[model samples]
Target chain A: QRMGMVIGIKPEHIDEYKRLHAAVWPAVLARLAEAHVRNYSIFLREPENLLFGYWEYHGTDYAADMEAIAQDPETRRWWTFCGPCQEPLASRQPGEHWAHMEEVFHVD
Target chain B: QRMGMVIGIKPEHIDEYKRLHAAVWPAVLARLAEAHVRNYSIFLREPENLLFGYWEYHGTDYAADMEAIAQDPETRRWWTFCGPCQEPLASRQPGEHWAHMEEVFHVD
Candidate 1:
């Protein structure tokens, strides 16, 4: 399934955020791939400082796979640097860090 | 270059909007491909009714290629059905229809 999510990144943290993603840890990337996540991409809108994330999930159980990523020691470690750079949307529901978006149009 | 854009879709017009994109006209698609645009995708957020578009431009002349698209007869015709269904962001520039986004993070 195609998935999209959004959040904000601190202006001062943009460089750090970009740096972290430029070469995500091998173990972290491996964990996501093992979770059946692919074609992952994230975009930022400056001034507004918003980050839009897009990815495709191929696994049957998304929650379990996400849990696996969260539980992985290295993946958890990676988030420490990246998480601080993000600012969750104020309107996002409780328990949501990155607000999810829905697919409306697509062409191959 | 990778590009992203955002606009709003009228809640009531979502069905019609989706219908039009479900089978975009061949000529319009051809024109975009000729302009070196690829891997285009649009996502929507409910309640807010926002649409986020992402694509890649493989050519050097961004402005000229965009102008080519604007000048295409088929594309112009196609937008007549789509334009009315969209709402530009209040923060968007005066001449911008869909506010452009910046790429901050990406991984293959």
Candidate 2:
């Protein structure tokens, strides 16, 4: 799946957020790869403080894969710093930390 | 710079909008290239009917190149079909058809 998700960032924490992602923990990166997530990217829109995340998921069982990631101590630890910097959309579905976006058009 | 933009689409016109983009006119596509637009994509979120666009601009003179596209007779004609299907955001800046979004983070 070509996944797109959105969340908001606290303006004050922008630097810290970027700093962490600049070198996302290797263990965390490896876990994402293990889950079949690839071409992951995040984009920020200031003033509004929106963060749009994009990724491709090759896994067949998303729930299982995500649950495994959640159970990882290191990944959870990584989220400790990253989560505080994010503000999810109020309209997001229950259980979604990031609001999912749907693809409308794409071209090479 | 990587660019993100947002607009709205009429729910009733979703089919028309998707149809237009599925085979966007060659002239329109070529003009975008001339304006140095690359990796362009548009995404939709239903219910809200929001459309988000992403692109990379490699041009030195954005305003001039965009103006050239605006002046193209074929492109203008192409817009005749697309324009009616779109609903510009109410809060968009004056003179802007698509509200611009700011980027905060990116990674390979």
Candidate 3:
């Protein structure tokens, strides 16, 4: 099992951000579940300006699954609404949307 | 191996958040490494008011390491700057700074 979080956001729009997440799109939600994602969550910070996204995956081929999801039209459309609200790190690759973080440890 | 992420933050302060992270305290970094943590990263969401923190660990005891770190004086001071600007989910228990998100899946 693996855990991960991605931070991306300015501070002022916290309310709007929360509102959008209060109800994520059904298609997106379905697709994630279909792809074997579970126990997912998002959190926010005000003063330091941060946003965290967490999810669990139980898939054998991580890269393949993600690639498959990227080819998904519905997922792409979903990203349209989501992508605008995020600012990827300068270190991230050009075509990349969500920056990947490395895993260090875990316990069951 | 296991992976996880926590999200929490408002949007406007993204730049400052990045700035602080661009140079984490040496002691904090050292302590984490000593505790067998590696490959940690933080991401942000702008309009959505989200901040994600990611890390990997090679420790046998998860809760103990965290508790030990919490007891550290420097970590508490670090939280002083970090905790105020953020709001935890209502679901989180009291005395928790970073809320734990469950793991659902992973692929090596």
**Per-prediction RMSD in angstroms?**
2.4, 3.2, 9.5
- Rank list by lDDT: 1, 2, 3
Model 1 has a DockQ score of 0.64
* Candidate structures ordered by TM-score, highest first: 1, 2, 3
Those runs of model 1 whose alpha carbons end farther than 4 Å from true positions after fitting are none
Full-model lDDT for every candidate: 0.86, 0.82, 0.61
TM-score of chain A for the candidates in order shown: 0.94, 0.94, 0.83
Winning candidate number (DockQ): 1
Per-residue lDDT of A1-108 in model 3, one digit per residue for the tens?
A: 545445466555556666667667787787777777776656554444445456778888877777888888988887776666666665566766665554322222
Could you give candidate 1's per-residue lDDT for residues A1-108 as a string of tens digits? 878888878999999999888888999889888899988888887766888898889999998998888889998888899999999888788878889887766755
TM-scores of the candidates in the order shown: 0.85, 0.77, 0.52
Candidate 1: residue B48 Cα off by (Å): 3.0
DockQ per candidate, 2 decimals = 0.64, 0.48, 0.07
- Error of model 3, residue A44, in angstroms: 15
TM-score of 2: 0.77
Q: Is the docking of candidate 2 incorrect, acceptable, medium or high quality?
A: acceptable
The C-alpha interface RMSD of every prediction is 1.7, 2.5, 9.0
Relative to the real complex, the DockQ score for model 3 comes to 0.07
Docking quality of model 3: it rates as incorrect
Write model 3 residue lDDT over B7-75, tens digit each, in one string: 456455555556666666777777787777776655454444544556677898887888888878997
